[model samples]
Target: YMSLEDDAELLKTMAHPMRLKIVNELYKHKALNVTQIIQILKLPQSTVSQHLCKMRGKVLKRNRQGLEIYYSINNPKVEGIIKLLN
Candidate 1:
């Protein structure tokens, strides 16, 4: 069983507005790059990058293709969380 502290940290990581938007977008699209998400969210590249970094560290996993990095939900629990939010 997971500790309360670990669950809290996971929830905390997903609590940010931008991060939630990122998750929703990723859930619909499957995977996305920084530029694509920035265009969709109309957020600054830096802001998107910050949110992506946080999610990538905790909930998402990324695949690099040359200069581009595409990120997706790597954790099944994260998919469930996204479904709950939807």
Candidate 2:
């Protein structure tokens, strides 16, 4: 598929398959901290964070549980559209 490059942040994340998987993981889990995400994917911490780098809450948002941070889908509308459309 030839996706238009007009949207920078959207494209930045869409370009990486891993990032897309991460979003689904969060959705499936309802929420997850970095540690659990890494374990579920069996991916290294550095690799996961690197994949998560850039973008805004539109892709992945964080929640602070005391000192720990949790993650969930950032773009519920977009994610829903993509899921159903696909």
Candidate 3:
């Protein structure tokens, strides 16, 4: 269960432009790897990875398949928030 503090923290995390974009893409696709995200965002690999690294445990889930790791929105609460963005 997320407390009020947690909700605020999650919102703060999504406040970043790049992070929000990443979450929106993940919400639409359901899941994707870092490389795929890089292609979509057209940003540097390190930049995308850093944003993902920030949200990995808090709002995202990483399922590793050998060397490939797919990221998805782990918090159902975020789905609605992301939906409201568009």
* lDDT per model vs. reference: 0.86, 0.69, 0.89
Question: Which order, best to worst by lDDT?
Answer: 3, 1, 2
lDDT of 1 by residue, 29-81 (tens): 99898889999999999998888887776778888989888998877778899
Task: Name the candidate, 2 or 3, with the larger TM-score value.
Answer: 3
The alpha-carbon deviation from the true structure for residue 73 of candidate 3, after best TM-score superposition, in angstroms, is: 0.9
Residue-by-residue lDDT tens digits, candidate 3, 1-86: 99999999888888899898999999889889988899999999989998988888887888998988899987888888999888
Give the least accurate 10-residue stretch of model 1, judged by summed lDDT. Answer: 1-10
What TM-score quantifies how close candidate 2 is to the native fold? 0.74
RMSD, one per candidate, in order: 1.5, 4.4, 1.0
> Each candidate's TM vs. the true structure?
0.89, 0.74, 0.93
Candidate 2 per-residue C-alpha lDDT over 1-86 given as tens digits, one digit per residue, 9 for 90 to 100: 22455345565665666776777676677788889979988899999877766534546777888998888776655467447634
TM-score of 1: 0.89
Instruction: Name the regions of candidate 2 deviating beyond 4 angstroms.
Output: 1-8
Error of 3 at 8 (Å): 0.8
Model 1 CA deviation exceeding 4 Å by range: none
Least well predicted 10-residue stretch by lDDT in candidate 2? 1-10
Which numbered prediction scores highest in TM-score against the true structure? 3
Q: Local error of candidate 2 at 50, Å? A: 1.1
Candidate achieving the largest lDDT: 3
